[PDB]
């Protein structure tokens, strides 16, 4: 079909009688020539293309960086390339080194930085520990009066069990970063500890964001409760997306007269994989979201999207360093791994389990 | 000497050693008191070199809370003597003497092998645990194996 | 507040359920598909602003064309569950509810998890076919995604013609698994060949088949 | 001109170190202070080498044999003229630079916490002039790295190729376009899609 | 900050005096009992600070491996001192310096 | 350290003895073992005196 | 009637803690008590009480009898705005810090005009070198176009 | 005689002409260091 679009694209009338200026005999000779050559340029039945593909991929490998580096002077940016990556591809290793989601946006958000920062904040995960500044245990006996002269006006402005105090101070920069408030957190704590932990909190415009806690020998228990509090309380976030990167893109889009021109649009490149949750978030173009742990892509989108993704990975890996393979080889390789229903990596476990001859498998 | 307690992982941040001709990671307070320094002022006196290091002291607490059940010498001596392979039936009487000649000879032999000097070895172990807890809390780089 | 996100999730799930019930050959009128949100809040939530799942169930009859091309197609029953951790109780009574009207296929949407002892209560509802789905799965329609191409299930004969053109046996085709989201989106059974029309950058349009198990 | 372009680059370095030591340096996203600092220095020095190398390359006349062997594209390229006429440049070890084997210093011939260009590998001459001992030592280190990596990866790639070939060696093109394996699992219905 | 017994030299664990409503540090090996002057029993600081730490600096003036500067000392106004960058270095630690005067032997900075 | 150093430079102690001072954590180590790889060097008179 | 007396007492005191106005103060809280009538209500009180006795800011209790607008402090949604000034400057300072740490790094690299791209044919290209081949064969140069993003390698 | 574990503690000059820092500008002979941060060595 593409070839018919080519022939119909070239030999139209004005581009024959007003640019090439052929006659008749030459025209006939040309059509005959096209037929002859196209009939000469076909594949030949009896052509072991599998070996040619395994070689034509096995050959640009033997001259590629075995440590690559680059972004090596940056610890916030990790990436696996060259050999180790190809080895982590042909093995379908269920644990890679740099998991990274690539999340797009809708048009209204794509170019308004503020909304993009809102959606940027909505995804990132955060426990209660990620905002704590100090944890302090006190023996403050009076249930309705305190020794900490700071919290005096709180308790004396609060009344209009156990005698031990669990008091902690937070950090404002991250309570403003995640756009949280004091209440919402207090609600989280009261919900997670039922009725055992009597909770007390202070206003936003204080000078220290303080949380006071009591329970209804009484010391070690409060330590265990404390570590549990810091370790197991989430305030938002898709659990498993510990970093988000705001990234720019320059894409090509047609104009109004049908001409492709560039265009600057924002996008997200995040650390950690969790597709089944990030797909379902308002503001996210759920149709374009793409990852690179194609095991999950298999567990979510089927076998075909997994084929396309795997091809895209190999194409990126080989194409990073100037080398250029022709396509039917890589398409064959990616259409051998996924042609039984699941990923069949190339080692010995994935192969040995087939139904081929015993000699063909013992000779390996 | 092995320091357990992964950064906020593995529950207890306890220290457990390893001896020649034994079976299990024997704790550290048990070898201190097993050498004959049963109080705690002497132990935390040997290990740390300051009374303001409440950070290392903060990490030390689980070691004494772990070595509380043993309070005197003989029960720790035989606590070690029972694990050290040997035969099986060298009870208190002979087995204590087994663990004793174990903690004279194999343990730190380059220091000495004559009795009446175990203080020396206790000082040395103090320096060792000190250096470990100087490396763990990140005050000095890890050793390079190719210097 | 937190109300609108739950309501939005339930809404998207219901819409995806309807589109799924539309690509399988049945009949859904456009007054039902193009439901906006005020109709959903007004017709599903209580005066408290909280849902009633028992007011979201419905029945579906097949169209004439799909009735002609695919012969073994009865009716469809769609019911959202009520309890959260679906155990033996709701599963048994639901199985009786399908065994009562003698209908042919039911969809039992759960919420969080199903007990295994009740997960044995699926080969006990024959000759009908009960098909379970989680709700947090159907929030996104996987078919509008870029990569996933069109999957079109074939009829009985056309399959025989396809096996005559290549001279094959049903086991020598590229396979798809019974639990693979675009294989239950269409509701496949052992022996049904889906056709795929993939794009290609060496000939534009490439048609490739694939069988199930 | 070349020696001056390096002098300003070197002088510039003295400025970045000053800022980093008075806490007046912008922190780059995703990076600690010291990573951003190291990244900055490297950009400045690599620019200098290229700027100096570009200068020497453009002076050359129209019969300097090397311009004929490189201009013909048969053997060599720009980095050779640059490393023979201008500055040898930077030395790298695992992407980062000459670490401190000794405690807080590279070689015992330098002070502690010294981080000028020549204190951590930046070679400053060209092979026609000569090499100071420290620079020669660092260069030998880098070359040793190269020989080691070369000694490592080749066998890895060979075994990888053996796995690929032993995996794909029975896929044929039968007399009607099908690309079946040894027993009929149609891999591709029409070879190469076309 | 914790204390020790005086009749056993073992550490004192915090014990509660239920009746008088007060805190004590009581030995678990003996019968010693001491009053508690401070209400706090346990502190666990998560996020920390400090980009300082000049570390041990005894006889650091004659150390030939350290660089020297013409910085004037705030104490004796001498313009000849040794300088260093920090000790105990986290990955996030500042690159600011510590100067040590060769005349008055005082550690000073640059603010 | 000075007295021991001169008692080495006089020949009383075998010249291949290591007198190493870590002024940092305050450790004075002396090495007299077998296998240490070493090399000679000139000497610069650093003493602030003459 | 617990709150009917307590809301008053607490309001009276924390509004005196900062002559005849007694009825204007009482009229205001009595309207504010039935205003919250519009356990989640109790949480609304703690907001009003706290911002008042957060002393430090006399303006609030001191600037609450002069004039002000009253029904605003109800559907306020200005918890960031309602006192005090220094804090507002911080929440505007912290925000910029949070917006900066949410982004990512980029790339540096030197560019030279000694190479040409095969795609867009631009002379902006960075490079680096590794030893891909043996010890007898020359180095392998990796080039990258700093315009379209194309990459290639050298023999 | 100095060995390896001692070499950490010392401080070396490369050439004798360096023991007394000088009071040039040539393209043939190479560029020797400067010791940028050391106005006085020992
Ligand atoms: Zn005692
Ligand atoms: Zn001074
Ligand atoms: Zn290009």
PDB file of N, CA, C and O and ligand atoms in Angstrom, chain G residues 117-122 145 148-150, ligand 3:
ATOM      1  N   UNK G 117      25.216  16.383  11.387  1.00  0.00           N
ATOM      2  CA  UNK G 117      24.184  15.377  11.607  1.00  0.00           C
ATOM      3  C   UNK G 117      23.670  14.834  10.277  1.00  0.00           C
ATOM      4  O   UNK G 117      23.645  15.548   9.274  1.00  0.00           O
ATOM      5  N   UNK G 118      23.262  13.570  10.274  1.00  0.00           N
ATOM      6  CA  UNK G 118      22.759  12.938   9.068  1.00  0.00           C
ATOM      7  C   UNK G 118      21.288  13.221   8.835  1.00  0.00           C
ATOM      8  O   UNK G 118      20.762  12.972   7.751  1.00  0.00           O
ATOM      9  N   UNK G 119      20.622  13.746   9.859  1.00  0.00           N
ATOM     10  CA  UNK G 119      19.191  14.024   9.781  1.00  0.00           C
ATOM     11  C   UNK G 119      18.894  15.481   9.432  1.00  0.00           C
ATOM     12  O   UNK G 119      18.384  15.775   8.351  1.00  0.00           O
ATOM     13  N   UNK G 120      19.215  16.391  10.348  1.00  0.00           N
ATOM     14  CA  UNK G 120      18.902  17.806  10.159  1.00  0.00           C
ATOM     15  C   UNK G 120      20.086  18.598   9.612  1.00  0.00           C
ATOM     16  O   UNK G 120      19.939  19.761   9.233  1.00  0.00           O
ATOM     17  N   UNK G 121      21.253  17.960   9.578  1.00  0.00           N
ATOM     18  CA  UNK G 121      22.478  18.573   9.062  1.00  0.00           C
ATOM     19  C   UNK G 121      22.854  19.862   9.797  1.00  0.00           C
ATOM     20  O   UNK G 121      23.115  20.892   9.175  1.00  0.00           O
ATOM     21  N   UNK G 122      22.879  19.788  11.125  1.00  0.00           N
ATOM     22  CA  UNK G 122      23.275  20.919  11.958  1.00  0.00           C
ATOM     23  C   UNK G 122      24.637  20.630  12.587  1.00  0.00           C
ATOM     24  O   UNK G 122      24.951  19.479  12.891  1.00  0.00           O
ATOM     25  N   UNK G 145      23.638  14.690  18.419  1.00  0.00           N
ATOM     26  CA  UNK G 145      23.166  15.975  17.917  1.00  0.00           C
ATOM     27  C   UNK G 145      22.378  16.724  18.987  1.00  0.00           C
ATOM     28  O   UNK G 145      21.427  16.188  19.558  1.00  0.00           O
ATOM     29  N   UNK G 148      18.162  17.730  17.116  1.00  0.00           N
ATOM     30  CA  UNK G 148      17.098  16.770  16.840  1.00  0.00           C
ATOM     31  C   UNK G 148      17.176  15.575  17.785  1.00  0.00           C
ATOM     32  O   UNK G 148      16.163  14.936  18.077  1.00  0.00           O
ATOM     33  N   UNK G 149      18.382  15.273  18.259  1.00  0.00           N
ATOM     34  CA  UNK G 149      18.580  14.199  19.214  1.00  0.00           C
ATOM     35  C   UNK G 149      19.217  12.955  18.623  1.00  0.00           C
ATOM     36  O   UNK G 149      19.317  11.926  19.293  1.00  0.00           O
ATOM     37  N   UNK G 150      19.647  13.048  17.371  1.00  0.00           N
ATOM     38  CA  UNK G 150      20.272  11.918  16.688  1.00  0.00           C
ATOM     39  C   UNK G 150      21.614  11.538  17.311  1.00  0.00           C
ATOM     40  O   UNK G 150      22.317  12.386  17.860  1.00  0.00           O
TER      41      UNK G 150
HETATM   42 ZN1  LIG I   3      20.273  15.728  13.312  1.00  0.00          ZN
END
